[PDB]
Design an enzyme around this catalytic site. Sequence first.
Site, PDB file in Angstrom:
ATOM      1  N   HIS A  12      68.047  72.074  59.588  1.00 34.22           N
ATOM      2  CA  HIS A  12      67.032  72.778  60.279  1.00 34.22           C
ATOM      3  C   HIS A  12      67.857  74.121  60.994  1.00 34.22           C
ATOM      4  CE1 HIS A  12      64.175  69.707  59.245  1.00 34.22           C
ATOM      5  NE2 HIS A  12      65.111  68.769  59.796  1.00 34.22           N
ATOM      6  N   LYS A  41      62.486  67.800  48.620  1.00 32.83           N
ATOM      7  CA  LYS A  41      62.208  67.510  50.077  1.00 32.83           C
ATOM      8  C   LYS A  41      60.721  68.239  50.046  1.00 32.83           C
ATOM      9  CE  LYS A  41      63.970  67.353  55.048  1.00 32.83           C
ATOM     10  NZ  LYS A  41      62.509  67.705  55.565  1.00 32.83           N
ATOM     11  N   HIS A 119      66.468  65.183  65.129  1.00 36.77           N
ATOM     12  CA  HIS A 119      65.133  65.376  64.250  1.00 36.77           C
ATOM     13  C   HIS A 119      64.257  66.525  64.458  1.00 36.77           C
ATOM     14  CE1 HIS A 119      61.485  63.741  62.396  1.00 36.77           C
ATOM     15  NE2 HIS A 119      60.956  63.765  63.486  1.00 36.77           N
ATOM     16  N   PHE A 120      63.706  66.994  63.458  1.00 33.12           N
ATOM     17  CA  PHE A 120      62.850  68.173  63.550  1.00 33.12           C
ATOM     18  C   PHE A 120      61.478  67.610  63.407  1.00 33.12           C
ATOM     19  CE2 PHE A 120      60.046  71.946  62.847  1.00 33.12           C
ATOM     20  CZ  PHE A 120      60.559  72.517  63.744  1.00 33.12           C
ATOM     21  N   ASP A 121      60.490  67.517  64.423  1.00 38.45           N
ATOM     22  CA  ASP A 121      59.178  66.830  64.436  1.00 38.45           C
ATOM     23  C   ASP A 121      58.311  67.789  63.799  1.00 38.45           C
ATOM     24  OD1 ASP A 121      58.379  64.061  64.661  1.00 38.45           O
ATOM     25  OD2 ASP A 121      56.828  64.772  65.806  1.00 38.45           O
TER      26      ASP A 121
END
Length: 124
Positions: A12, A41, A119-121
Amino acid sequence: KETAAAKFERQHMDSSTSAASSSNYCNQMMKSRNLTKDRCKPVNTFVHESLADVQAVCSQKNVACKNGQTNCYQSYSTMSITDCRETGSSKAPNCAYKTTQANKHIIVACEGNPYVPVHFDASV
């Protein structure tokens, strides 16, 4: 293996560029960051802000992640980001992505010591 903090950076962060510079940014990044190996992805976002700024988000506004986890934080300032969306056609490893540069608040999950993004939400 790769720590969750490192994986987050590889998947990210794109601090070295201020923004995407062509419609092919996502095709290039998804491939070089190894996000198309076994499966294209479907969606992935890269943040064009310094690592210091993204890490600071972990002590910003605490919100619930989309899965309900309580350790997500939303950035107070918007940030330069690029959304990558896998198209139709393509079958791994011959993936194809739509690039969308924008300025939005980001939401990330944080944890650990140091307490950093893992984590990228989403972006808002």
